[PDB]
Copies of this chain bind each other. A is one copy, B any other.
Amino acid sequence: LEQIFIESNEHNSHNQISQFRHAVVRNKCKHNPTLTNLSFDTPVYFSIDEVVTYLENMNNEVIGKLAGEGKPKLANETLVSDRDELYFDAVQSFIVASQAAATKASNGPFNGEFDRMILRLHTR
């Protein structure tokens, strides 16, 4: 599975491999918790599209730098505890980050670093 989807010829993969494994391994649990101690390899139902949404939307996430706002900020100034609750479901739109204090925000850790992943994945 890792092989077909994901190639490391560019060798920029470390973080994407990590969060990939994170997204997949997470996906399974929601479908049922009756099984326990699940892992990456264990085959139980999971979707590839729902996942690939996660890369796109998490790429360009913005988190508040405002005191007491250490959470992804939405276009309507909303904050979310876990990205998967909505990021998996659908892409989200976030305010642009700015240096000024009035608009003090930080981009997601991966903003602008793995869009290519999705481009190649879809050509696949």
Contacts and interface: CB of A to CB of B under 8 A. Distances in A.
Q: How large is the interface on A (under 10, 10 to 19, 20 to 34, 35 or more residues)?
A: 10 to 19
Contact of A10 (B11, B14, B35): B35
Copies of this chain assembled into the complex: 2
Instruction: Give the secondary structure class of A's interface.
Output: loop
Interface string A1-34: 0000000101111100000000000000000001
10 contacts: A8-B37, A10-B35, A11-B36, A11-B37, A11-B42, A12-B36, A12-B37, A13-B37, A14-B36, A14-B37
Given A11-B37, A11-B38, 10 more contacts: A8-B37, A10-B35, A11-B35, A11-B42, A12-B34, A12-B35, A12-B36, A12-B37, A13-B37, A14-B37
Interface of A: 8, 10-14, 34-38, 42
